[PDB]
């Protein structure tokens, strides 16, 4: 009946002075915009239709045309930035924020979804949506004793949108909006639905990216414990943002890092550093590097959990991006460690696979490994063992590699390579 009209048909009807005639055209447009193959967004936009759709949102008399507009407008907003902009320019935002008060669950849901697309577009629209006052009524949808009395899809949509109000970084969302959203966020972080937990972690993940003052906000809400339970989840859609949250937190202050360690995160890392999904492995190793870039108290916790063998493991055989992070892990460790701690690292077999990576087409990593190899030698001088150490490096082919690096297209690489040969060979 209303399946596959021409856009010319949709325009003729929507322009008619007949509300039921308009409703059937707006239902045609919606079915156009939600088809599987390429949706005709630009023809709709160019047909001049966004303003009449935006006006249908305010027809509280006709509940069904509100829904079909909301939906249509949602799907237009789901396109390119130029396209979302068309929807925003039509005056859609204040209109959708009104729809949040609707007595019809399926309409308020749709307005949530729509605001989600609009804030998702980037910093400027996110901020505009908040300036129009969306946060107050969004959160009021969640003001219930028990979240489980809400419908799955409803809650999930509502979570996704809140999550886009946290996204996009510079400029990061207003501290004031974050302060207000965090209690509801912390609450969602405890709901048992994998999709809700996924998008909650993504939000925290978004918030904890950036300046340590931002990290503090989150950590002071005491979510670090719950994040670590999520770190041990079995659903990779949950583990991934949970892991990026934890990893963001440990780029902050030592006291912030210690909240993570104190919460037992290190117990999960044998699993994470041998995880089949490459993206997990790379981010777990990155996390390790910012822990080994900490206090000696804290490095020692890495040791006691027997994580050094896993780092040696990753250095040996991961894909390159992960190995690059593993080098930093080792350089940071040899920068802040005990005499005894650098000895342990060597006794776990760090030297052989450290050298294999001196044969890599990247200067960035070579710079890192050379600095690491340096700090080991410096601890070798403090214990008078630089003889035994220089043997190992030669006996595994390291010097074959190191020597040939003086002849390298780089300043501080040729420098530090031959600086070693001087003082030790």
């Amino acid at each position: 009946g209303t399946v596959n009209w021409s856009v010319e048909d949709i325009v003729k009807g929507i322009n008619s002075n007949n509300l039921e005639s308009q409703l059937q055209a707006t239902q045609a447009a919606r079915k156009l915009l939600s088809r599987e193959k390429q949706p005709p967004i630009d023809n709709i936009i160019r047909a001049g239709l966004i303003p009449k759709f935006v006006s249908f949102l305010g027809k509280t008399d006709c509940s069904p045309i509100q829904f079909e507009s909301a939906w249509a407008l949602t799907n237009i907003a789901s396109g390119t930035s130029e396209q979302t902009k068309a929807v925003v320019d039509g005056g859609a935002i204040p209109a959708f924020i009104s729809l949040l008060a609707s007595p019809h669950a399926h309409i308020s849901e749709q307005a949530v979804w729509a605001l989600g697309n609009i804030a998702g577009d980037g910093s400027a629209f996110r901020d505009l949506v908040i300036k129009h006052g969306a946060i107050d009524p969004l959160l009021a949808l969640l003001a219930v004793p028990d979240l489980s009395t809400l419908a799955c899809g409803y809650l999930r949509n509502l979570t996704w949108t809140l999550s886009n109000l946290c996204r996009n970084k510079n400029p990061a969302p207003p501290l004031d909006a974050v302060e207000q959203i965090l209690p509801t966020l912390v609450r969602l972080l405890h709901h048992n639905d994998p999709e809700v937990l996924a998008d909650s972690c993504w939000a925290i993940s978004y918030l904890t990216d950036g300046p340590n003052e931002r990290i503090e906000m989150v950590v002071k809400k005491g979510v670090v414990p719950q994040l670590v339970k999520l770190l041990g989840a079995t659903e990779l859609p949950i583990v991934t943002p949970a892991l990026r949250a934890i990893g963001n937190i440990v780029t902050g202050t030592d006291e912030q890092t210690q909240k993570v360690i104190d919460a037992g995160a290190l117990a999960v890392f044998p699993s994470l550093l041998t995880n089949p999904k490459t993206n997990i492995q790379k981010e777990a190793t990155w996390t390790m590097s910012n822990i080994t870039a900490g206090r000696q108290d804290q490095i020692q916790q890495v040791v006691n959990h027997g994580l050094v063998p896993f780092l040696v493991g990753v250095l040996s055989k991961a894909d390159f991006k992960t190995q690059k992070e593993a080098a930093w892990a080792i350089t940071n460790y040899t920068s802040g460690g005990t005499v005894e701690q650098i000895v342990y690292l060597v006794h776990c077999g760090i030297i052989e696979p450290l050298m294999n990576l001196l044969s890599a087409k990247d200067t960035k990593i070579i710079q890192v490994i050379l600095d690491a190899i340096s700090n080991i030698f410096q601890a070798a001088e403090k214990l008078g063992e630089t003889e035994k150490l220089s043997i190992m490096i030669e006996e595994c082919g390291g010097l074959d590699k190191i020597e040939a690096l003086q002849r390298h297209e780089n300043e501080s690489v040729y420098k530090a390579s031959l600086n070693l040969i001087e003082k030790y060979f």
């Binding site: 990216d209 950036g210 963001n248 780029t251 990155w286 910012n290 900490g294 930093w328 940071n332 802040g336």
Partner: peptide
């Protein structure tokens, strides 16, 4: 030593 992000 710490590396964002």
């Amino acid at each position: 030593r710490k590396r964002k992000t």
